[PDB]
Amino acid sequence: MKVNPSVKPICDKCRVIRRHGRVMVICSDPRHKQRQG
Amino acid sequence: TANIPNKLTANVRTRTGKGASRQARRDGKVPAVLYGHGTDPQHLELNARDFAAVLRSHGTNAILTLDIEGTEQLALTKALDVHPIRRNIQHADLLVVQRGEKVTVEVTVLVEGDATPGTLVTQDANTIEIEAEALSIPEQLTVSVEGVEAGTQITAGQISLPEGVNLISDPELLVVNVVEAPSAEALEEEGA
Amino acid sequence: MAKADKATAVADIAEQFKASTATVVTEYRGLTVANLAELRRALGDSATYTVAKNTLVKRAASEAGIEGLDELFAGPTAIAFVKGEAVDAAKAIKKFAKDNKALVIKGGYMDGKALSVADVEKIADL
């Protein structure tokens, strides 16, 4: 769960979504999963 | 080559100085002055939005007609004051001109083509000075490059120009220079 | 594709129709690029085959009394033209479809009136 302040879609498939203010990005490739903060 | 007038309304500014100028600029109107042989220079406001839009749509140069309380004047843009940060226009100058007169214009030039592996692209000059008619103001210039090698210094006066324009700039000026591409050794040599 | 491109395509189809005598529309679905390739080669003797847009062909059909196929292009549409004779392309497509099992003929145009699938099969036998 790579945690950091700069979050960006890695491949053309990641998705960036919001949840209780903590913007996180999700993808089928599990490695991509990263939140902001 | 002929263009189309870009009609735009304008009003005579009421107050002159930093006060009125900055107030209008905040409003969204850029102060403007026009002058020429008419022996009657006077000063007006513009619309920032339409102004910038027309600037973009017609390039650095464009020939315009202005609306002054119903009066229609023909003028060509000469100088400008672009905001260093904001990307907005502070001041433009419209110089009255009639049909059938000679003016001096600086025209930009664009480059396109195919480059060889041993070809290095470099642009010493992006603009050149040319004389033309009021209705014959262009907005871009193009040059074709194909299969150039080693030293391929392209002369500005060597370019082919449409009719009705004379090359004000002396032929000693160079427009496009192609030199030998650098390698790792040169890259490390430079900068130290 | 641009609007100019659409106009050009509609004009091209209009000239082809005016130069043609009979035509048929089928469904290209379920056919490999290969089988399309050999069908095109085989029909390259007299027939000309291509793909057209449903709505563009619908608008281009208003020029002639070929509106019978408007209610018929619904779904993927393949256009067939018979430059040489008429039954050549019909029989060719019928046998290709029967061999593939992936080609379904939706209809055809002849004598200015739309006819059924069985009638088209009978005409192709003719």
Binding site: - | G59, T60, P84, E112, A115, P117, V121, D124, G191 | -
Partner: protein, 136 residues
């Protein structure tokens, strides 16, 4: 590692930075360039790093410029010396920058790659900056 090779004197007073950058406020030479926003120092190390970032990615095509040049010296008294006892020694050279100045200038075919390289240059720079083209 840009550095003036000789000056009248090796140290200079503190600066005044007030004022809008007038020199070179418009791109001229190439076809694309950066433009800073806020007053700030720019070290020779920063300039060289940005130059490396631009150059190494651009690789073969195009050639760059550097409208600025760090000239004014600076000093910092070594640790463990009670302040006083005269000026310190010079450590690095810096080039000043004002809002609206253009930092780097590029002439490469493609706008996308020019933008990408200049964006990395921005990220490596110490102050805000943004792309700008030749047009009026």
């Amino acid at each position: 590692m840009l550095i003036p090779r000789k000056v009248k004197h090796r140290k200079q007073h503190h600066p005044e930075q007030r004022g809008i950058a007038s020199g070179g406020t418009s791109v001229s030479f190439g076809d694309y360039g950066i433009q800073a926003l806020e007053h700030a120092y720019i070290t020779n190390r920063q300039i060289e790093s940005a130059r490396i970032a631009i150059n190494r990615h651009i690789k073969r095509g195009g050639k760059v410029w550097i409208n600025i040049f760090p000239d004014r010296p600076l000093t910092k008294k070594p640790a463990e010396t009670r302040m006083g006892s005269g000026k310190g020694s010079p450590e690095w050279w810096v080039a000043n920058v004002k809002p609206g100045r253009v930092l780097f200038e590029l002439s490469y075919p493609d706008e996308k790659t020019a933008r990408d390289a200049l964006t990395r240059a921005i990220h490596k720079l110490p102050i805000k900056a943004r792309i700008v083209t030749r047009e009026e």
